[PDB]
Symmetry: D2
Subunit: 384 residues, 4 copies
C-alpha cells in the first residue's frame, strides 16, 4: 500500500466514487487542461458530461436531481477531479454550493425550479457576495434590495464573480435591512433580467477556465418570490455555505498537490543529470519525503473536517477553518516545490505542475483568506 | 467542543484511559516536574504509582502483568502523561518497549520471568542499541556476543542509554554472527552480572529525570537462555520496536505541545501590556491559531499511524515514520512559539513551557532522527 | 526610509540609479502588462535603454560600453527591474554575452561584435543548456568539428532567451573530449545556414523574452568566431555566470522593492472593517518582515558585487550565496505582497502578480538554487 | 579566503581588535564556558582581564577610561568574544551599555566618578528597566522616585536584572513625573544603599554565567545628584542605550552562530556513519550551505546597522531594529541546526553547540523582543 494512498480509510462506496471521478478527470479534463487555461475557455460540454455522472449536484438532495452524497464523499470526488483541472473543479464546487444554498434554505417551489437544471448543468450558477468595498469584511456589502410591492429593486455591484456572464442563475447576497450581517438577504437573480449587466472578463494568474467579471445591478427589479429564506437570513446562508466551501476548496488543493507529488516522483526517477537519475540526490529525496508527509497530513485534516461537518459536531466550524488554512498553505507549497523539482520544465505551460501552482495559489485567498481563517480560529480558542 | 479537544474521535474506553492518565499526570507529575529536572532525579516512587494504574506495561499481554491495550490506546495514554512530564513519560515508553520486546519475542520462561516485575516496575528496563560508532547506522554496532558453552561472552560499549545504572534489566543488541543486519541478536543482561559497568551520568539539555550513562561490557558472561528470539533476529526485533517507538515518542511530543498551547492561551488572556491582555494583539492571536492548527494536524497524523500499525496495514511502517517526522518537528515548533509568547518568563525554570521545549527537542533526534525518517520515507515512495 | 535603495552608494551611483529608475517608470512600467500579455520583445524601448548606456553596462568603453563596475551594474538592473523584471533580466543576459566577447575575445572580435550589442542594434543570446544538460552543464552534446577554417556544428540548445530575435548567439559546444575541458565558446550569427529555431515556448513568466530551442544541423561557423582557446569554453561560461547570477539576483531585488512599496501604499489606502488594512497588526508585522528581508538581500547582492569586482578569492562563493539568498527571499517577498493585495493581487491589472511570476524563475535559471548549494557546500567542506 | 571569513571588509585596525578578542575568548572563555554554565558562576576575574584589554568600556570616551571605539569596532569585538561564551559576552555588552549612558548623558562629575571604575570593571553595572508589570510596555513602569530634599525616595521593583547582586552600579529607570515615557528619569543606585535588596537567584535555560534577580526598592534614599540627565529624559536615554545594546546582542548571536557553523563543518568531516563521513550526505551538505549563507547575511545586517548608528543616520533606529530581528532569528536557527547535525552529542553539555542554542535563544526575547522589533519597523514604514 502506497504511503500516500488516497483510498485508505474510505469505505467501498467512496472508493468507487473516487475511481469514477479520477477516471473522468484523466479522460476528459487532464488532456484539455492546458488548452482551457491558455484560451480561457469555460468547458460547458465537459462539465455537462461530469454532471451526467452526478457531479453537478454532488451533495444536493436526490428529489431535485442531486446525488445526495455526504461531505466526505464530496471531498473525495473534488480531490480526484482536481487532479484533472483544479480551476474547473473549483468552479464545479462553487456551482454546487449555489445549488446547495437553494436546496437547503429554499421552499419547495424554489427547490424544484432552480435545482434540477443546476444538477444537470443545463444551467450554471454563480455566487455573488464580494464587492469592491467588501471582501474579507463581507458583511459590510452595499448592494441594496429595496422592497416595493412584490419585487425587490437591486442596486450595486459584485466583484470577482466566477462564471459571471455564462451562468444563468446568480445567488446574490444583498442588503434588505440595516447595517451588519442581520440586514442581509439571499436572492436569486436570473440571467436576462432587466437591470443586470456584467463587467469585462478579468485577466488572472490562474483559474482561467472560469470567467471572472463584475455583476452589476441598476434598478434591477426581482420577484420577492426569488428570495431564499426570510429577510435577514442572508449572511447565515453565506456563513453555512463557507463551511462546505472551505472543505471543498481545500479538497481541490489536495488534488493538485497529489498530482504534483506523483509527477515529481516519476520525474526524479526518469530525468538524469550527472549520469544518474535526479532521485539519486539526497536533497531531492528529502524534499519529496516532506512533500508526501505534508500531503498525508493535509488529507487527514480535510477529511477529518468533512466528517465532523456531516456529523454536525460542535467543533466542525473551527475544524473546517483549520483544515482550509492548513491544506491550502501546505498544498500550494507542495506544488511549488514540485515545480522546482522539474527545473526549467516546470516553468513551461507544457508541464501541468505550473498550473497546479497557479490555480492552488488563489485558494489561500478564497472562501475566507487564510488571514481570516486565523482570526476565526484564534477567536474560538481564546473564547474558551 | 474545543477545537483542540484531545478526546474527540476516541471510543468510550479510551476517553476513560485518557482521563485517568491526565489526572495522574496533573496530580503526581506536573507538581514535581521542575524538581526532577533540576535535581536530575529518577522518579522511582511516582513511576511505580503509574505502574499500579497499569502504565508499566500498557501494551503488554495481561497474562504476564500487562494491561493489554492497543497502539492507539497507548498513544492516548502517553500523550496525556507527557503533559505532566515529557521526560519521564518518554522513559516510561522506553521501559514499555523493552517489556514488549520480551513479551512479543521471548519464550514462555523468559516472558513470565522478566515481564511481571517490569509491569509493576519493581524493576526498570533500559534499551541498549546505540554505540559510539553506531548511531543512525545502528546496524553497524560492534558489541560482540561470543558463544562459549551455555553462555555468550559480551564485549563492547553502548552509549546514551536511558535509565542506565538504575535499570535492572537491559535489552542489549549485540553481534553474534557476521557483519551487517543479519548478524545481530537480542540478549537480556541483568544488573549484577560480572563484567557489566556504567559510565558517568551525562549532563544534558533535557530528559533530565532519566539518567543517561554508557553501558560497558568487559568479558561479561550472559546465559544463552537470555537471548530473545533466535540468533540473528536482533535487527528484526529492533525494527519492529521502532514502529511503536516512533508513535510513542511522537505521542510524548503531542502532550508537550498540547500543554504548551493551553498554557499560552491562558497566558495571553491573563497577562496585560499596553493596558490590554496580550491576546488583544493580532500577531499573537495568529500565532496561537497556527499553533492550534498544527497541533490538531500532528494529533491526526499520530493517531492515524497508530491505527494503521495495530491493524497491521501494509502502509503502517511508512505512516509511523511520517507521523514521527511531522509530529516531532511541528510539536517542538509549537512549544518554542509558546515559550516566545511567555516573554522572559518562558526562559525561567519556574515556567513549564521551557521544559516542554527542552524535552521535545530531542525527540527530533531519537527513534530514528528526522533526517533518517526522510531517508526511509523517500526510499519507500521512490520504489513505488 | 528603512528601505532606501540609495543608502551607501556614492554620488555617481546615485545618479545612475536615478536615471535607471526614471527610465523604468516612464518607458517600462506603463507597458509591462502589455508586453507580458502579448509576449512582445520590446526592441524600441530596449534600444532607448542602450542609448542611456544600459546595452553594455560593464563593457569596456573602447568598444561602446559604459565601463561601469559590478556594483554600479547591480544598482542599475535593480532599478530597471522595478519597471519590468522580465525585460531587465533579458538585458542582463544580453550584457553577459557582450562581456564574454569583450573580456575573452581578440581585438578583431571585440570591435566586430561588441559595438552593435552596446547600442542594441543587434541582440545577443547565451546558449548553454540542452535537453540532456541543464544543471549538469558540462555534459552538453552539441559538437563542433573543425573543417578547414570552419567548425561544423550539430546539436540543439534549449530554453534560449531571445532566440529568434537575437543576431548573436554565444554558443558553448564540444570541440574536444568529455567534461568541462572539451568545451569551447563560439559566436554564431543569425542567418547562418544550418541554424534554425524551435517553437516559441509558452511560460509562466519572462514573457517579454521569446524562449526557443536553437538547432544546429551541419551549421558551418568560422573558426575565427571562437572566443578564447579550444577547451576554455566552460571556464568562460562559468566566469560569465558569476556576474550573471549577481545581476539576476539584482532583478529579484527590484521586483521585491517594487512589491514592498506597492504593498505599503495598498495597506494604507484599502479599507476593510472600517479601518485601513494597515491597522491590522499581522499585516504590519508581515510588512516589517518583508522590508527586513529585502534590506538583507540587498546587502548580500551588493556585497557580492564588490567582491567580484575586486576579484577576491571568496567572490565565487559570495556570488552563489547572494543568488541563493536573494532569489529565495525576494520571491517570498513578492508572493507575500500578492497575498496582501487579496483577490486583486491575482489580477493581471496589478503589477505584483508579474513580479511574482517573473522572480519565481530566478530560483531555477542561471544555475538553480540547488546548484548554488552545491557550489557553496563544496567550498565550505574543502577548507 | 573562507566564504564565512569574519575579517573580510574590516580595516587593519579592526582585524587586530578581532584577533585580540578571539584569542582572548579561545584562551580565557571557551575552556571555562561549560563550567560557568553548570555552576552558574559570574566570572569576575576573567571579565576583569577582558577589561584590561579595553573591553570594559569599548565605546566609552577615552577621557573617562574608555577605548573610544566605534559601533562597528564594538560589534566585531563582541562577535569574537561570544565564540568563547555568549552568555558572558552578552553581560559585558550590558555593562558597557550602562557605562555609555552615564558617559553620554551624565554631567562631568558623574562621568568621571562612575565611568572609570566601570571601564576597568573594578565595579560592575546592571541595567534596570523591566518590572513585573512592564516588559515590552517599558514606558508603563511603576517604580517611583519622590523628591525629598536633595534625595529621591525610590519604591518599587525591577525584574530579570542581569548581574543583580553582583553589580555595584545600577542604572534605574524610575517614574519622577506623570504617566508614560515623559515621566521617567534615569538614576544611578549604588550597592549598599539602605532600602535596596535583591530577590532569589532565578533558574534559567541559559545565560547562566549571569545572576538574574529582582531588584527591590523600599523607601530607598538616593541622591538627586545621581540622576542622569534631566527629569523626564529617562525613557529617551533608555531607548538610545538600547539601540546600541540591540546591535551588540545581535553581535553576540553572530558569534554563537559562527562558532556553531565551524563546529558543524569539522564534525561532518570527522564523524562517520554508513562507512563515510557525515559530510558525504548531500542533505547535510546543503543544510550547512544554508547555515553559512544566512550567517553571512546576518553579519552584513549587523555591521550595516552599526555603521548607520555610528554615523547617526536618520535610518539608524530602523536598521538597528531590523538587524536585531534578523540576526537573532537567523542565528538561533543556525545554532539549532548545528545541534541537529551533532546528533545525540549535540544534546550533551560536553558539546558547546547546545549552549550556543540555549544562550542565543533568549536574544529573540530580551533587549526588546522580536515582536517589539516588528512594531518599531512597521511604524517607520507605514508612517513614511
Ligand atoms: C538565464 C540564463 C542566461 C541561463 O539560465 S544560462 C544556463 C545556466 N545554467 C547554469 O548556471 C549551469 C549550472 N551548472 C553549473 O554551473 C556547473 O555545471 C556545476 C554543477 C556547479 C559544476 O559542474 P561540474 O561538472 O561538477 O564541473 P566542476 O568540476 O565543478 O567545474 C569545472 C571547472 O570550472 C570551475 N568553475 C565552476 N563553477 C565556477 C564558478 N561559478 N566561477 C568560477 N569557476 C567555476 C571549477 O573550479 C573547475 O575548475 P578546475 O577543475 O579547472 O579547477
Ligand atoms: C538584556 C537586557 C539588558 C534587557 O532586556 S533591558 C530591557 C529591555 N526592554 C526593552 O527593550 C523594552 C521594549 N520596549 C520598547 O523599546 C518600547 O517600550 C516600544 C514598545 C518600542 C515603544 O513604547 P511606547 O510606549 O509606544 O513609546 P513611544 O511613543 O514609541 O516612544 C516614546 C519616545 O521614545 C522614542 N523612541 C522609542 N524607541 C526608540 C528607539 N529605538 N531609538 C530612539 N528613540 C526611540 C520615540 O520616538 C518617542 O519620542 P517622541 O514621541 O517624543 O518623539
Ligand atoms: C479567482 C477569484 C475568484 C473569485 N470568485 C468569487 C465568487 O465567485 N464570488 C464571490 O463573492 N467572490 C469571489 N472572489 C472574491 C474573494 O472572495 C475575495 O477576493 C477575498 O474574499 C478577499 O477580499 P479582497 O480581495 O477584497 O481582499 P481584502 O479583503 O482587501 O484583503 C486583502 C488582504 O488583507 C487581509 N485582511 C483583510 N482583513 C484583515 C484583517 N481584519 N486582519 C488581517 N488581515 C486582513 C486579507 O487576508 C488579504 O491578505 C474571487 C476572487 C478571486 C481572486
Ligand atoms: C537524551 C537521549 C537519550 C537516548 N537514549 C537511548 C537509549 O535509551 N538507547 C539507545 O540505544 N540509544 C539512545 N540514544 C541515542 C540515539 O539513538 C542516537 O543519539 C541517535 O540515533 C543518533 O545517533 P548519533 O547521536 O550517533 O548521531 P549520528 O548518527 O552521528 O548523526 C548525526 C546527524 O547526522 C544525520 N545523519 C546520519 N546519517 C545520515 C545520512 N545517511 N544522511 C543524512 N543525514 C544523516 C543525523 O540525522 C543527525 O542529524 C539517546 C540519545 C539521547 C540524546
Ligand atoms: C524562462 C527560462 C529561460 C532560460 N534561458 C536560458 C538561456 O538563455 N540560456 C541557457 O543556456 N539556458 C536557459 N535556461 C535554462 C536553465 O539554465 C535550466 O532550466 C536550469 O539550469 C536547470 O536545468 P533543467 O531545466 O534541465 O533542470 P534539471 O537540471 O533537470 O534539474 C531539475 C531539478 O533538480 C535539481 N538538481 C539537478 N542536479 C542536482 C544535483 N546534483 N543535486 C541536487 N539537485 C539537483 C535542480 O536544482 C532542479 O530543482 C532557461 C530556463 C527558463 C525556465
Ligand atoms: C535572561 C534574561 C535577562 C534579562 N535581563 C534584563 C536586564 O538586565 N534588565 C532589564 O531591564 N530587563 C531584563 N530582562 C527582561 C526583558 O527585557 C523582558 O523579559 C522582555 O522585554 C519582555 O518582557 P516580558 O518578559 O514582560 O514579556 P511581555 O512583555 O509580557 O511579552 C510576552 C510576549 O508578548 C509579546 N508582546 C508584547 N507586547 C506585544 C504587542 N504590543 N504586540 C505583539 N506582541 C507583543 C512579546 O514579544 C512576547 O512574545 C531579561 C530577561 C531575561 C529572560
Amino acid at each position: 500500500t502506497s504511503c500516500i494512498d488516497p483510498s485508505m480509510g474510505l469505505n467501498e462506496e467512496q472508493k468507487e466514487f473516487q475511481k469514477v471521478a479520477f477516471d473522468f478527470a484523466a479522460r476528459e479534463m487532464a488532456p484539455n487542461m492546458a488548452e482551457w487555461d491558455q484560451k480561457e475557455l469555460f468547458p460547458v460540454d465537459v462539465m455537462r458530461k461530469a454532471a451526467q455522472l452526478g457531479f453537478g449536484g454532488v451533495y444536493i438532495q436526490t428529489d431535485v436531481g442531486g446525488s445526495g452524497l455526504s461531505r466526505l464523499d464530496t471531498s473525495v470526488i473534488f480531490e480526484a477531479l482536481a487532479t484533472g483541472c483544479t480551476s474547473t473543479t473549483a468552479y464545479i464546487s462553487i456551482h454546487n454550493m449555489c445549488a446547495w444554498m437553494i436546496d437547503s434554505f429554499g421552499n419547495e417551489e424554489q427547490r424544484h425550479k432552480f435545482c434540477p437544471p443546476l444538477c444537470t448543468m443545463e444551467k450554471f450558477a454563480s455566487y455573488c457576495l464580494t464587492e469592491p468595498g467588501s471582501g474579507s469584511d463581507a458583511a459590510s456589502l452595499l448592494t441594496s434590495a429595496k422592497k416595493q410591492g412584490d419585487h425587490y429593486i437591486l442596486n450595486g455591484s459584485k466583484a470577482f464573480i466566477s462564471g459571471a456572464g455564462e451562468s444563468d442563475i446568480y445567488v446574490v447576497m444583498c442588503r434588505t435591512g440595516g447595517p451588519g450581517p442581520k440586514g442581509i438577504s439571499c436572492i436569486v437573480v436570473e440571467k436576462g433580467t432587466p437591470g443586470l449587466s456584467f463587467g469585462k472578463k478579468e485577466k488572472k494568474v490562474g483559474w482561467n477556465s472560469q470567467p471572472t467579471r463584475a455583476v452589476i445591478f441598476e434598478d434591477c427589479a426581482v420577484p420577492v418570490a426569488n428570495r431564499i429564506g426570510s429577510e435577514g437570513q442572508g449572511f447565515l446562508i453565506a456563513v453555512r455555505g463557507l463551511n462546505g466551501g472551505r472543505i471543498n476548496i481545500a479538497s481541490c488543493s489536495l488534488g493538485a498537490a497529489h498530482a504534483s507529488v506523483i509527477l515529481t516522483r516519476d520525474h526524479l526517477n526518469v530525468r538524469k543529470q550527472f549520469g544518474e537519475p535526479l532521485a539519486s540526490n539526497q536533497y531531492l529525496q528529502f524534499t519529496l519525503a516532506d512533500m508526501a508527509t505534508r500531503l498525508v497530513a493535509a488529507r487527514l485534516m480535510v477529511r477529518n473536517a468533512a466528517v465532523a461537518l456531516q456529523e454536525e459536531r460542535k467543533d466542525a466550524v473551527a475544524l473546517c477553518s483549520m483544515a482550509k488554512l492548513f491544506a491550502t498553505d501546505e498544498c500550494f507549497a507542495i506544488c511549488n516545490q514540485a515545480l522546482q523539482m522539474h527545473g526549467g520544465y516546470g516553468y513551461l505551460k507544457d508541464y501541468a505542475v505550473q498550473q497546479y501552482v497557479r490555480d492552488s495559489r488563489v485558494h489561500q485567498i478564497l472562501e475566507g483568506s487564510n488571514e481570516v481563517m486565523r482570526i476565526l480560529i484564534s477567536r474560538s480558542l481564546l473564547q474558551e
